[PDB]
Amino acid sequence: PQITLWKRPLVTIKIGGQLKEALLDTGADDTVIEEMSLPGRWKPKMIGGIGGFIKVRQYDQIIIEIAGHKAIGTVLVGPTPVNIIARNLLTQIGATLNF
Amino acid sequence: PQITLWKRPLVTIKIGGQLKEALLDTGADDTVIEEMSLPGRWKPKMIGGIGGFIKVRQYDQIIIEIAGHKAIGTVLVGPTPVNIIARNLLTQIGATLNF
Numbered sequence: 001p002q003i004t005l006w007k008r009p010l011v012t013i014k015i016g017g018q019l020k021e022a023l024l025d026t027g028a029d030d031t032v033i034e035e036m037s038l039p040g041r042w043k044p045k046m047i048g049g050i051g052g053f054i055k056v057r058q059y060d061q062i063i064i065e066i067a068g069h070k071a072i073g074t075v076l077v078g079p080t081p082v083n084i085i086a087r088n089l090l091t092q093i094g095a096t097l098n099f
Numbered sequence: 100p101q102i103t104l105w106k107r108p109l110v111t112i113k114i115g116g117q118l119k120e121a122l123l124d125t126g127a128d129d130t131v132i133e134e135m136s137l138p139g140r141w142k143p144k145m146i147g148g149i150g151g152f153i154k155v156r157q158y159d160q161i162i163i164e165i166a167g168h169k170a171i172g173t174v175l176v177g178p179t180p181v182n183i184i185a186r187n188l189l190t191q192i193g194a195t196l197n198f
């Protein structure tokens with residue numbers, strides 16, 4: 001689809017079989033999700049935002065459906081008010097910005 | 100243009116006669132710019148992201164030229180580590196997400 005920005009660009013995602021709401025965010029590099037259980041090992045990762053840096057958990061090759069499109073890639077787990085789908089997965093489902 | 104997301108969508112802007120680099124971010128509500136002077140009245144505001152909250156000055160009716168596209172609206176000024184062009188001005192320039 002085409003998504004205007006008068007409202008937050010919120011979509012449904014499916015992960016570990018659960019439907020969740022998420023934000024499409026072109027300012028973030030790697031997807032970040034609220035605490036949940038994910039399979040396999042994780043690795044530490046530093047992410048910087050508006051207030052500074054934080055430590056989160058990095059999981060690789062996680063399967064996720066975004067607005068009905070299939071993606072597999074890195075998901076970070078850490079403290080956020082909402083799930084953030086970032087450039088890493090937005091590129092996999094062919095999203096681009098247009099103006 | 101059409102902006103792919105293989106890399107940070109960085110664009111050149113002009114604000115208060117100054118040229119700057121800024122990030123186009125569909126995930127933010129309000130535009131945030133690194134400390135600078137702007138004319139007019141302003142009110143205090145707190146904004147919060149990954150890493151915490153920061154104090155900003157909120158200026159209204161500020162004009163910004165974004166990659167050659169003029170736009171007007173609210174600009175938050177404060178110690179952000181990156182300039183962020185948010186939905187309040189992305190809508191004005193007609194930007195959409197497409198996939």
Ligand SMILES: O=C1N(Cc2ccc(CO)cc2)[C@H](Cc2ccccc2)[C@H](O)[C@@H](O)[C@@H](Cc2ccccc2)N1Cc1ccc(CO)cc1
Pocket residue numbers: 025026027028029030031032047048049050051080081084086122124125126127128129130131146147148149180181183185
């Ligand atoms: O920290 C924010 N990151 C940081 C960030 C960086 C890296 C990752 C994963 O790689 C994820 C998130 C982005 C903007 C930004 C880019 C570069 C440097 C600093 C900031 C994001 O793109 C924006 O959506 C919100 C995401 C956010 C939303 C709420 C709570 C936590 C996370 N922010 C915070 C923000 C809040 C208000 C406004 C003004 O409305 C602007 C920014």
